[PDB]
Amino acid sequence: KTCDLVGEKGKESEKELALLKRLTPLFQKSFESTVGQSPDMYSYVFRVCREAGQHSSGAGLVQIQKSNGKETVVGRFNETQIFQGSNWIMLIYKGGDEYDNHCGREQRRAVVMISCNRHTLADNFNPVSEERGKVQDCFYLFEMDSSLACS
């Protein structure tokens, strides 16, 4: 139902658990951004610890192909990692759908950099880039502003 962290119950990081708690105000929200040019125009939908897709795939972030409405899971919230810096929070969703001919067929992953902005609880969700040219450790990068990242 919500984000799952590495480690069995009772062995998860208290630091990560506390950060999930801090981001709770964003759980019911949904963020979207359409980018790219044909034939690769995509609509990215992102949610914090909740289903972002339409197929109960457990997606935390999905990539919708505008051409046919096909949905590709970029990252699943059942594989969440979250940590903070002085004025930012990085949220990572691993376990997305596998690449077909890139990154050794590695499962996609979403990396979201949340920057401190005292004037908004959440705003400016924006796809930044996709690294698909490595033998491993590929990822989609996104950015967003949130006062919850301020310390």
Add this chain to the structure above:
Amino acid sequence: TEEKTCDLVGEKGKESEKELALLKRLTPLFQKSFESTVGQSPDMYSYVFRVCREAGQHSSGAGLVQIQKSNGKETVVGRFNETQIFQGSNWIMLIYKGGDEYDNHCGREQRRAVVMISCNRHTLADNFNPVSEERGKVQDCFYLFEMDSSLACS
């Protein structure tokens, strides 16, 4: 013979051109060295960090070392021959894996250094600072540091 430098994942010819271009962007920082003394006895540490160059004193290929102030013992936090680097709009994250293994934490996995470099148009590099150490997970633990650099802007 050149000084040993950062090595990215993948054999030569298969590395990310994006990562290669970012390393090139930080070239001006290679010759520098950053230090930060933190903590309280008996755990007072001196963290020494360098970008793509040896930060230790034992030619073990450390990109970031943690020196035990009490006895001078050097613990490798991350080795630059296992570098990952990527950028956002106004920041660059540099990761050094392959540090010395934990003895009783994180499933005894190798230590890892994560450095968040934020844009600061006023200086080429400043305020290297240890932020925290996550040693309470079954895996994927890491030491986090921050630093300012105009090279991380735009």
